[PDB]
């Protein structure tokens, strides 16, 4: 059974095993079972923690259901792959990646009033190619007033740093005026419409280039793994893999009664059904219930 | 798909584009005489304008039956696609067995013949491992777990550097 | 044995989801 905070997180989820746990829960609620009162407890740090481990149970089967567009030509397999991960973000409780990483910035730097500390604990989330090209401009402006540039905005010592960091943001390719004029906004709905259509022209060219950089690293890893494997003799390969397969079974067999280990060996039995159902009719495929 | 769909028998396809299947619709104002012809078979029914609108009421929602997962099968299809590019260059290997006769054995230097018999034993090493396609499904499981951990990001599954740098420009070049 | 289902055949197999569930069932009752 599910602990009723999982089943609230699997309602908008769309993978198979989360929906069959929802559907057998909704079948219990048709037979008059009482919906348990969800907890108005678990203060802010615990609520952020169990949300992190409930989103990762919607993300983890969902990532395995998204076909990578490896070796494809064009932008639409990469835009499909990106859009399936957007919808996996929305199904798991994430907001937009712009709204999710900006919340990560302002949470990590809620204590900072100097820019050199803002550029130092937002280090894990920006490029080191971009963290360095802002630390060059920062340590020239701090070599200009010989005082630390403040995270104030109304300080003029920040204003000519932000005017030079805007010149860095174009030096990466980021439209710094377009991004700012979207997350600020405008009064009329017609002049904010023309800035959303050119933010989303950047944004779609942005998230495609992160998906396409993820595909080009899986393509390069798989071509590196294969060429290391094609240089082996066949007798080495079959016993390297049978050693790795058998070691990984006994890690699931020595695990006493754990839910992941029963589900591991239930899926080894379901792979062997797939190989057996294909052997019965190979031009048909596996047998589904129809 | 959404809940309500607004297509059917208006601006519809009137005819087929191939020759493998022959489509003929005859639209009146209310109904339509479709005539389909595929192979030897033929069928012709009457589709109402409010019979195609009930079609998108209960959705099909196709989904892939994979051996392991859709992710793994897309990595394994790429390794099968990469093994084909290596098999195509073992296709262009010169037929060394045309020089196995004893008029090449005895005319040749005894060390250039042992190199030739080693280069023929090497092709059978390369060819018997590029056609070991039952090993590609376990090479795909060496790519999956490191990819799947990058998708378990604490920010977003679809986050990357270009977006997170573009959202630092909004965060830094606004007031504090 | 044959002809399982469709909604049972749509499951991604060797996902984690149950290590993630296991370390959520021994962390949240331990940090509360």
């Amino acid at each position: 059974a599910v602990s009723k905070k999982e089943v609230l997180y699997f309602l908008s989820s769309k993978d198979a095993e989360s929906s069959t746990a929802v559907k057998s829960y909704l079948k219990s609620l048709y037979a008059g079972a009482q919906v348990e009162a969800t907890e108005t407890d678990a203060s802010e740090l615990i609520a952020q923690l169990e949300k992190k481990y409930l989103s990762a149970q919607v993300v983890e089967p969902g990532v395995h259901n998204i076909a990578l567009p490896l070796g494809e030509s064009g932008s639409a397999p990469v835009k499909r792959y990106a859009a399936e991960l957007f919808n996996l973000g929305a199904q798991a409780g994430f907001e937009c990646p712009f709204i999710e990483v900006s919340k990560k910035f302002g949470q990590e730097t809620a204590t900072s009033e100097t820019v050199k500390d803002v550029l130092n604990k937002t280090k894990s989330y920006v490029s080191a190619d971009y963290n360095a090209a802002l630390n060059e401009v920062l340590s020239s402006v701090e070599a200009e007033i010989n005082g630390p540039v403040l995270f104030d905005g109304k300080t003029e010592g920040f204003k000519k740093f932000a005017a030079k960091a805007k010149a860095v943001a174009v030096s990466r390719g980021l439209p710094a005026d377009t991004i700012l004029a979207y997350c600020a906004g405008s009064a009329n709905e017609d002049a904010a419409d023309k800035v959303s259509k050119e933010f989303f022209t950047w944004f779609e060219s942005a998230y495609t280039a992160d998906a396409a950089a993820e595909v080009k690293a899986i393509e390069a890893e798989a071509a590196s793994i294969l060429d290391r494997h094609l240089a082996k003799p066949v007798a080495q390969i079959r016993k390297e893999q049978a050693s790795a397969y058998a070691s990984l079974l006994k890690r699931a067999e020595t695990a006493k009664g754990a839910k992941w280990a029963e589900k591991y060996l239930e899926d080894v039995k379901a792979v062997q059904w797939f190989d057996a159902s294909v052997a019965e009719a190979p031009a048909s495929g596996p047998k589904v219930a129809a | 798909l959404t809940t309500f769909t607004f297509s059917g028998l208006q601006d519809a396809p009137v005819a087929a584009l191939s020759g493998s299947i022959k489509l003929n619709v005859a639209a009146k104002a209310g109904k339509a005489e479709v005539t389909v012809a595929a192979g030897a078979a033929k069928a012709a029914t009457q589709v109402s304008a409010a019979a195609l609108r009930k079609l998108s009421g209960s959705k099909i929602s196709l989904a892939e039956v994979a051996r392991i997962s859709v992710l793994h099968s897309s990595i394994q299809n790429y390794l099968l696609s990469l093994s084909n590019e290596r098999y195509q260059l073992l296709s262009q290997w010169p037929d060394f067995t045309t020089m196995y006769g004893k008029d090449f054995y005895y005319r040749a230097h005894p060390e250039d013949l042992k190199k030739f018999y080693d280069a023929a034993d090497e092709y059978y090493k390369l060819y018997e491992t590029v056609t070991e396609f039952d090993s590609l499904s376990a090479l795909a499981s060496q790519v999956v777990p490191n990819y799947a951990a990058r998708r378990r990001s604490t920010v977003h599954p679809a986050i990357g550097s270009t977006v997170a740098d573009g959202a630092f420009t909004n965060f830094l070049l606004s007031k504090q | 044995a044959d002809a399982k289902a469709l909604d049972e055949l749509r499951k991604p197999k060797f996902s984690s989801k149950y290590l993630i569930q296991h370390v959520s069932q021994k962390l949240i009752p331990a940090v509360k």
Binding site: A213, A220, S224, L249 | R86, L89 | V23
Partner: peptide, 30 residues
């Protein structure tokens, strides 16, 4: 065909580490 199960998160946001071109098309052409 089966993988080690992992339950850990990615806290950084990095580039995905493109590996190098292995020399096997150029070794098998030699």
């Amino acid at each position: 065909y089966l993988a080690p199960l992992r339950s850990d998160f990615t806290e950084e946001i990095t580039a995905p580490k493109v590996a190098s071109a292995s020399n096997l098309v150029n070794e098998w052409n030699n």
